């Protein structure tokens, strides 16, 4: 009766913050990731 | 009902767009015309603003076409001025 | 006014029924002939401009 | 899942049979549309409601004129199933300053520049 | 007199050894331990694999989706084994052994508490897929008899087809598709989103084109 | 509600039923029936 337990971790909100063409000041984070994309 | 009325160009509902609607309903006994009916004045104002929009859209489209013609001609003349810059001397003799 | 003509003026309603039946017959003969010649008589709508 | 429909672009390419069936001419295309709203935005998604509000078609059976350019053609392609598009053709010229009060729309899309109320 | 004709001779067909159907086991020899969800889209729409003939000339053609479990495999192999001629015919399985696990909770159980335990193994079959293929030095008629007899008892609709009958059916379906007289197809209305009709359709209906509905196949639909 | 795939033919939405009613195969009609012609 629910032998499996643990996978309740939420999403990391990682991805591209600034796409192509967006003006970016110095120090703005462009993309968050794991496992280099 | 009328959908035969559309084939004669007559706006299927006979109580709009005709002489049955747009003519004045009454007049005085000595011959003087009536003041204009209020729905007639509203329809005439709406027809005027529709025609104004038609004129404005056609003029904006023609002005856009003429400005694009001038942009193409000016770019082509500027590049033709760019082509002729030669004063060549290297392999001539 | 068609119902009021039906009740109070039956001669005018017989005239209207004769008109509708004649235009029906003209439409039928126009359907058999595609016109050619006359497109009837009680056809030929009056044109307003 | 239900999502917005992108349409293949081979739909909006007229065949010569289509040019014979309808009246249009592939050279000299018409300049203006006459769009009329003939189906409710209710029980349709919110993007179709927004496009209908943008184009100016809130009141049904009320004609509105637009340009014939690819941007408004994209907006009309989104809601082409709620409308009736017919070309504004002009029998006389487009209306001058003297005419403007005396004009009419005349279904069959003929913006007649002289509108009397007398028989021919 | 009555005109006799040359028979179709068979000197180009060699029957292989082991001409009868092999045994099909109930469960794979390595039992699967992780329960899989009910991916119902393996019985849905047209088949993409096992669609054309390989060795024989005769087949059972599936005309709708369905899951074959071990009872259907036993029925098919028993009937085709006992009703063929082993010295002139041979049959070939065109479906793999049943591999998809299906779990049932215990009898009379409340809802909740996780998935059940794996009981029995099935194999999905889509529409248009061939199921058994037969060949040999025989005609179409006798195998049409005992293959319609088998194909009646499958969980979906099925027919016994030959190469000629399948190719005739495909040409006739395409000729019906190009002879159509009303201008409104399901394809033209579905892909172009006429009438806003994509609200009541599926995203799968742009490829199914109205010929498919659930696990069912309507072969007159065009 | 039921799944997308069912066992019992799954009665359609009425707009889809109208769509499948209006797009049926219509066979070509010869002018004179071919046997009635020599
Ligand atoms: Mg997770
Ligand atoms: Mg969470
Ligand atoms: Zn006959």
UniProtKB/TrEMBL annotation, chain B:
Does the keyword Signal feature in the UniProt annotation?
yes
Supply one GO BP term: mitochondrial translation
An example molecular function term from Gene Ontology annotations:
structural constituent of ribosome
Q: Which UniProt keywords apply?
A: Mitochondrion, Ribonucleoprotein, Ribosomal protein, Signal, Transit peptide
Q: Where in the cell is it found?
A: Mitochondrion
State a GO cellular component annotated for this protein.
Answer: mitochondrial large ribosomal subunit
Q: Main localisation, per the record?
A: mitochondrion
Question: For the region Disordered, what residue ranges are annotated?
Answer: 76-93
Entry similarity comment:
Belongs to the mitochondrion-specific ribosomal protein mL52 family.
> What name goes with this protein?
Large ribosomal subunit protein mL52
Full protein segment contained here? 24 to 116 of 123
């Amino acid at each position: 009766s629910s032998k499996n337990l643990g996978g309740k971790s939420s999403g990391r909100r990682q991805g591209i913050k600034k796409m192509e063409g967006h003006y970016v000041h110095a120090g703005n984070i462009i993309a968050t990731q794991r496992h280099f994309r | 009902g009328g959908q035969w009325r559309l084939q004669q160009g007559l706006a299927a509902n006979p109580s709009g767009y005709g002489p049955l609607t747009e003519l004045p309903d009454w007049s005085y006994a000595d011959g003087r015309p009536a003041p204009p009916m209020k729905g007639q004045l509203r329809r005439k104002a709406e027809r005027e603003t529709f025609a104004r929009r038609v004129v404005l859209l056609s003029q904006e489209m023609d002005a856009g076409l003429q400005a694009w013609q001038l942009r193409q001609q000016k770019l082509q003349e500027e590049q033709r001025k760019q082509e002729n810059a030669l004063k060549p001397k290297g392999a001539s003799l | 006014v068609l119902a009021d003509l039906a009740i109070y003026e039956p001669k005018t309603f017989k005239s209207l029924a004769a008109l509708a039946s004649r235009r029906r017959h003209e439409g039928f003969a126009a359907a058999l002939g595609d016109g050619k010649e006359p497109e009837g008589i009680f056809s030929r709508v009056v044109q307003y401009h | 899942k239900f999502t917005r429909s992108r349409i293949p672009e081979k739909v909006f390419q007229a065949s010569p049979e289509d040019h014979e069936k309808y009246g249009g001419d592939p050279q000299n295309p018409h300049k203006l549309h006459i769009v009329t709203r003939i189906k409710s935005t209710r029980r349709r998604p919110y993007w179709e409601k927004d496009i209908i509000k943008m184009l100016g078609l809130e009141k049904a059976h009320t004609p509105q004129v637009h340009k014939n350019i690819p941007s408004v053609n994209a907006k009309l392609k989104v809601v082409k199933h709620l409308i009736r598009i017919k070309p504004l053709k002009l029998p006389q010229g487009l209306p001058a300053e003297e005419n403007m009060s005396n004009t009419c729309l005349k279904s069959t899309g003929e913006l007649v520049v002289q509108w009397h109320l007398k028989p021919v | 007199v009555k005109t006799l004709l040359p028979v179709p001779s068979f000197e180009d067909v060699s029957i292989p050894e082991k001409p009868k159907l092999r045994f099909i086991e109930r469960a794979p020899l390595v039992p699967k331990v992780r329960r899989e969800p009910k991916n119902l889209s393996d019985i849905r729409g047209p088949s993409t694999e096992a669609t054309e003939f390989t060795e024989g000339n005769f087949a059972i053609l599936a005309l709708g989706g369905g899951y074959l479990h071990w009872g259907h495999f036993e029925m098919m192999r028993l009937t085709i084994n006992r009703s063929m001629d082993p010295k002139n015919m041979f049959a070939i399985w065109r479906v793999p052994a049943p591999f998809k696990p299906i779990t049932r909770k215990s009898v009379g159980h409340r809802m909740g508490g996780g998935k059940g335990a794996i009981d029995h193994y099935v194999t999905p079959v889509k529409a248009g897929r061939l199921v058994v293929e037969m060949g040999g030095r025989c005609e179409f008629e006798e195998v049409q008899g005992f293959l319609d007899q088998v194909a009646h008892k499958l969980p979906f609709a099925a027919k016994a087809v030959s190469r000629g009958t399948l190719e005739k059916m495909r040409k006739d379906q395409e000729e019906r598709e190009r002879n159509n007289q009303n201008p409104w197809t399901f394809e033209r209305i579905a892909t172009a989103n006429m009438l806003g009709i994509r609200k009541v359709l599926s995203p799968y209906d742009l490829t199914h084109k109205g010929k498919y509905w659930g696990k069912f196949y309507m072969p007159k639909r065009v | 509600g039921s799944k997308a795939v069912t066992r019992h033919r799954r009665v359609m939405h009425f707009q889809r039923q109208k769509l499948m009613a209006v797009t049926e195969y219509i066979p070509p009609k010869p002018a004179i029936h071919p046997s009635c012609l020599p």
